[PDB]
Design brief:
Name: Genome polyprotein
Assembly: monomeric
PDB class: transferase
Number of domains: 2
Number of helices: 21
Entry title: Crystal structure of HCV NS5B polymerase
Structural class: alpha+beta
Distance between the termini: 41 Å
Oligomer: monomer
Radius of gyration: 24 Å
Keywords: HCV virus RdRP NS5B polymerase inhibitor, transferase
Strand order of the largest sheet: 1-8-7-3-5
Helix content: 40-55%
Amino acid sequence: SMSYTWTGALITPCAAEESKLPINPLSNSLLRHHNMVYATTSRSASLRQKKVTFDRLQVLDDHYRDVLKEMKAKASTVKAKLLSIEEACKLTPPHSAKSKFGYGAKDVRNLSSRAVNHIRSVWEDLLEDTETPIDTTIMAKSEVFCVQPRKPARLIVFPDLGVRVCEKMALYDVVSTLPQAVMGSSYGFQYSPKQRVEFLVNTWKSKKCPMGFSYDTRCFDSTVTESDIRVEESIYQCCDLAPEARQAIRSLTERLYIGGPLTNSKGQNCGYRRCRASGVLTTSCGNTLTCYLKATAACRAAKLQDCTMLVNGDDLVVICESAGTQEDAAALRAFTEAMTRYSAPPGDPPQPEYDLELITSCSSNVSVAHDASGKRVYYLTRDPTTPLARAAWETARHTPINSWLGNIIMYAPTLWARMILMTHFFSILLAQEQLEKALDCQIYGACYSIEPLDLPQIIERLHGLSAFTLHSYSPGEINRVASCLRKLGVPPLRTWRHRARSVRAKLLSQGGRAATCGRYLFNWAVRTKLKLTPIPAASQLDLSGWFVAGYSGGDIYHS
């Protein structure tokens, strides 16, 4: 059936939308070519609708049904708890969209009476109404990018805050624990950057002759079928669950997950959804499950030998035993025909890679460097264009999320993150004495509140001390970076070294947590380097739950 159906109404905005990068002295010292930095807006929604709207072809087979059974079997071992209103409430981001029922994120997190009552009723309705479609709002997402030699806005779809709290109560535990129990080590979200790189390298090294490939599904969310969603439910149904939870999962599937009406910000009726809603709690879990299912079965159909998979929602990367240049190519193609039939056509044509550094999964690739001792250290990196573009934007305008704080944390080892992202922001945070002001960044969909002063501890725990001494980066990685800088109009690395020297001096001058930031984050700025030793207060930090599960668009906030 058609992924979407439109009445004719338009996807509208609430407030005005800034699409151009301001001429700010602060952002300008970071990125000069401001005209190459844009933000998507509702004005392009139309194009995106034109791409995500199509008819889904899907033919199942024995391979598919066999992989399904296996997944169910593991599902059975899971026992999911029903969250309390209080618990689900504490999970709501402070700035989550308010309900159209006289209360907002702040009220929910505060267990206010009105909010709680409506939740109670929204919940009681999920237990009694097992059919009526549930209303969802559709909006144009606002994301920053760099022009190319422009992308249309992606469309977000979500139900009312009341429903979201109920989803958490009935499924937060399921989506936090089931992907793992089912996919085992193939479930990507359990790994921290360091751990993901560990898994990729060991896997590659364990193949007699490794062949790997990433697979890009053309608009995954619109490729997901009601059948996919119901199969996704049958898995959830294998868990031991409390009665009301079992009903909630059932009613949510029929009234929300499989599809439903779409309403713009003005209250008009835009159309109807019959595929994955990007903004629900089960979006990450379902996509990871669905994508894993289809890929596993496709892998068999294609006859790839000794496959090892890594799935992150819709992102997929496979590494296997190569047969031969030709065999591999013919097999990949067979794999794509499998996926196509399971309703997961390719966006970009899947190319078989024979060098781990060439494969790009989750927008990252492997690269090598050396620590103080010259020992080789594999780390995760990527083209820094978007990250830089967003730092600039986030510098000129106060945004809800700081993609830059997240990128530093996720790319603390990379060249650009240390030399630019760190230098630039600590520079500005000093000038505004906000080194202690907590900012909301985001990791795997989940929204975290973090104090810049903690970064050192965080980085040491998620990466290891080598993240402060990495050096001697590969030429390929250096060139991509320098190239990128010239393109955007960002000062050359030598300027950042100079700048980092200054910012460091100041940091140390302040003593305390800051003096540390300068010692560890910027030890690369000096030549008479300090011997960096484990940081005490780090291991005392609670980082449990940080790399356990993805929650893209899940409205999750545990900080």
